[PDB]
Structures are given as C-alpha cells and as structure tokens.
C-alpha cells in the first residue's frame, strides 16, 4: 500500500515567564518513531520505535542539532506573531507546524505537505503544486511575501520530492516487520435494548493496522448518516486501532440493517448482519 | 530526517 512520513511541531508561549514549550514528534504511517520535548532532561531527539534504534550517533546528533534550530526559529516566530496581531505579553499562544511526504505502492513520491496554524486555525500552507502559498489573512500575507522574495518554496519542494522520500524508503526497510504489516480487523456486533421499541445496533472493528478504515451502516438498502454515530479511531496501545459505528433502530427490524467494513487487511469488504 | 535549514515567519 501507500506510505507516508510526517513531522508535527507544537510551540506554546508561557509568558510570566518563561520559556516556550516546544514538542516535536515523527511518524511513518501510524507508527511514531522519534521525539523531542523541550522540557525533558536529555535535550535530544530520542527513539520511539525499535527499528530507528539502529541509526548511528551521527544520525542522533544530526537530528538533535536540527530540532534545536527549529525550536529557536519558533521562539522568534511567537514574538513576531505577537506583533503582527498586536496581542499583549500576558497571553499564552500556540503555533503548530506540519511537514512530510506521501509515496504510493511503488514507493515513488505522490504528495508533499508544509503548513502552519496559529491558535488552532490555518496560518499559511504550501499548496499541492509545491509552488504557491495559501495565506489565510493579512499577517499571513507578510509571511507569504517574505517567503516569495527569498524563494523558500523551491527549496521545500526539493526537500519533499527528494530527501524526504529517501528517508521514508530507508525507514520502511529498517522496520520491514513493523511498518509493512497489515492487520485485518476482528469484527462483531452488539445489540443493546436502549428504549422499548428502539434498539442500538453497534458494529465493532478491533486490532487493525493501519488506522485507516471505513465503517458504514445500511438499511435494506443504502448508506445512512440518518442516525449513525461514529467514534474517532482510537489507539489500542499495542500498535493497533479500534473503531465502532452505531445506529438506533425501531425494535423488531434489526434484520433490515447491515454493517460494511473496508480495510487494507480485508481482501474484499465485510458485510455483517445481526445474529439471534 | 528533518529539514537542515530553518526560516522565520
């Protein structure tokens, strides 16, 4: 299947003071593999999967040096944004930054990402063509213009289509048994009598990997977000994921309803019905 | 691996 590598950076001011919090994490697909936490004692990039543990000292020193450069960059940025929006010093604010690359089944580049949020809303994002920027407002337009005069986008596109993609392939192979496994969901169906002429039908998917999955309910019949509640896909904590979808049904008619499960672990989709 | 060049907003 397709694979991806992503990096997530969170920077939070804490004025009073003092120092802002900087947290960076790294993922290949749905498996975390590195971290940096400004508040930990080490002050180093640190491993979070068994297969990244084989990298040499120069990798770890390399990553640490670079993540510290990132961190001081977002230190300035927090100051700057405080100015672009005229906000005082007493308030706590947040920058989030995400970047990475998608490959398809052939492991050649497919897509690249490079975007920022301020206080939980989009700020500026490199577009899918890796050539132009979406600046969501007037402060973000100062950034866009600054980045255009200095040909920032061209250097990012070279990274994302090149180096980003070579690191992902290396990683996919370091951790072949981890990262390249698929885990078909274990499925079942509960039926709770909630009300007297009404019933809950609940479709479960357990122990699956990757996280991506589609759970739909049909009556007869066809799709219905006409009284289907979902939950966010959640980590089991062993490296697998869980999900459920529910419908409320008029009691005596469970028979009309079928749950439909799509994964990559499934050769073809599952259809489940309720069993007496 | 992460980016070896940094730039301010």
């Amino acid at each position, epitope marked *: 299947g397709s694979h991806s590598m992503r990096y997530f950076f969170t920077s939070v001011s804490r004025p009073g003071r003092g120092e802002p919090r900087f947290i960076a994490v790294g993922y290949v697909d749905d498996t975390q593999f590195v971290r940096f936490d400004s508040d930990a004692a080490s002050q180093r990039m640190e491993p979070r999967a068994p297969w990244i543990e084989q990298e040499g000292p120069e990798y770890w020193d390399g990553e640490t040096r670079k993540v510290k450069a990132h961190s001081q960059t977002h230190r300035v940025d927090l100051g700057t944004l405080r100015g672009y929006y005229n906000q005082s010093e007493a308030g706590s604010h947040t920058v989030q930054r995400m970047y990475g690359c998608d490959v398809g089944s052939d492991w050649r580049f497919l897509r690249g990402y490079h975007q920022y949020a301020y206080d939980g809303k989009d700020y500026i994002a490199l577009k899918e063509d890796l050539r132009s920027w979406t600046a969501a407002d007037m402060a973000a337009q100062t950034t866009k213009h600054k980045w255009e005069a200095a040909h920032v986008a061209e250097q990012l596109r070279a990274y994302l289509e090149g180096t980003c993609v070579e690191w992902l392939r290396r990683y996919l192979e370091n951790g072949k048994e981890t990262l390249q496994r698929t885990d078909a969901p274990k499925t079942h169906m509960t039926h709770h009598a909630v009300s007297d002429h009404e019933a809950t039908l609940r479709c479960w998917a357990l122990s699956f990997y990757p996280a991506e999955i589609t759970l739909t309910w049909q009556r007869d019949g066809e799709d219905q977000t006409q009284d289907t509640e979902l939950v966010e896909t959640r980590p089991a904590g062993d490296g697998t994921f869980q999900k459920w979808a529910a419908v409320v049904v008029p009691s005596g008619q469970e028979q009309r309803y079928t749950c439909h499960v799509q994964h990559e672990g499934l050769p073809k989709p599952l259809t489940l019905r309720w069993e007496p | 691996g992460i980016l070896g060049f940094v*730039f301010t907003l």
Partner: T-cell receptor, first 111, second 109 residues
C-alpha cells in the same frame, strides 16, 4: 549594509583576537569565511538564526556567539597555526539564500 | 552537495567572448554568481531560480540549466576591466551556500 572593522589587523602569536561583523540589513543568517592568497573561500562558522550557530568546514581553533540579530563576532584563539588570512563576513535575509559580503579584514600574526 | 567550476584560470584578449561553467549532480533550488577583486569582498552579480532562465548585466550573460543542475557565465567582447575572480554558489540543504572554487579571468589589452 554589512560592516566589519578594522581593515588591517596585526597580532603576536599566542594572542586571541575577535573580529567584528555588523549589519542593519535585517538579515537572519550570518557567515564567516577565511581566504588564503590566490585561493577560494573556506567556511568557518555560520548562524541561521539568533541564539543558534553551527560549524563550517574549517572550524577547529575558532569560536562564535550569536546573541543579537545584528552581530556575529569571530574569535581567533591559539588555534591551529595558520591564523594569518583575509577574513570575510556575509549575511543573507534567510539561511541558504543570496549572501552580501563585508569589505574584509586582513589579519597578520607575527612571531 | 558539490558545485564544480571550470576552468581554474583563463587568459584572453580584449574583444574576445567567453563562457564558464558551474556543474552539479543534483538540483539546486536557487544559484548565485559573484565577482571578487583581491583584498575586497565579492560583489553579488546575479541570482537565478527557474531552470532555463537567462539574465544579463553589462557584458555578462548568465543561464540556469533546465534541470537546475548547472549554470554558465558568458562575457561578450570582454575588456581589461572584466578581469577578476568569478564564483558560483547554491542553496545548501544545511542552511549555507555551496561555493565553487572559482575562475580567475585575465583580459589583456
């Protein structure tokens, strides 16, 4: 512009000396090179952003600090034994982009 | 990353035309040309960005290769005043410029 003072410097071996490099161009990123006669530039130290620096190709026996956006001082210590050179500072609006050089300092170290 | 400049020295006669090369095995997202006189800072002549693009100053013409892996500097009817060392440089992935070792040009009357 970028400035560095002085044009000519002269020291006795065993002395440390700090070369001054200032700019009001509003640049984030600063650089130091040495150049030997009839040669190209060799990178000693750079700084992509205030409060951060990193080593060049030819860093042993040199140090730097970057406490203020505007200034990138370079200290020549009892380093190796080839401190005599033309030293040139440059900056750029962001690291990796076009650089503007200063007029240079000629440092001779006598026995 | 490597940028290779050639030739190291070129001696020619006033009124003659000339090209010089800066070659790489990898793409460079932006590239620069400088001219240095001795005991002076390099003067920045041009930046180029788009593969294939051409730029001019006085008697100089610069070109970025299509695949963004090389650049040329051309002088048309060179004069004694074009004498100088000429350097190329490109965006480095570690937050620096990568420099070629230079070309030393003499134009003689």
């Amino acid at each position: 512009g970028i400035t560095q003072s002085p044009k000519y410097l002269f020291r006795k071996e065993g002395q440390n000396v700090t070369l001054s490099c200032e700019q009001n161009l509003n640049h984030d990123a600063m650089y130091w090179y040495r150049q030997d006669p009839g040669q190209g530039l060799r990178l000693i130290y750079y700084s992509q952003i205030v409060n951060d620096f990193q080593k060049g190709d030819i860093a042993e026996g040199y140090s730097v600090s970057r406490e203020k956006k505007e200034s990138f001082p370079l200290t020549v210590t009892s380093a190796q034994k080839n401190p005599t050179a033309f030293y040139l500072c440059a900056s750029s609006s962001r690291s990796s982009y076009e650089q503007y050089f200063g007029p240079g300092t000629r440092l001779t170290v006598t026995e | 990353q490597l940028l290779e400049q050639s030739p190291q020295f070129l001696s020619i006669q006033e009124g003659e035309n000339l090209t010089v090369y800066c070659n790489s095995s990898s793409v460079f997202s932006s590239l620069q040309w400088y001219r240095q006189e001795p005991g002076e800072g390099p003067v920045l002549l041009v930046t180029v960005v788009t593969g294939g693009e051409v730029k001019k100053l006085k008697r100089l013409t610069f070109q970025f290769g299509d695949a963004r892996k090389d650049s040329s500097l051309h002088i048309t009817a060179a004069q004694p005043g074009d004498t100088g060392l000429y350097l190329c440089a490109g965006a480095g992935s570690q937050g620096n410029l990568i420099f070629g070792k230079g070309t030393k040009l003499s134009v003689k009357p």
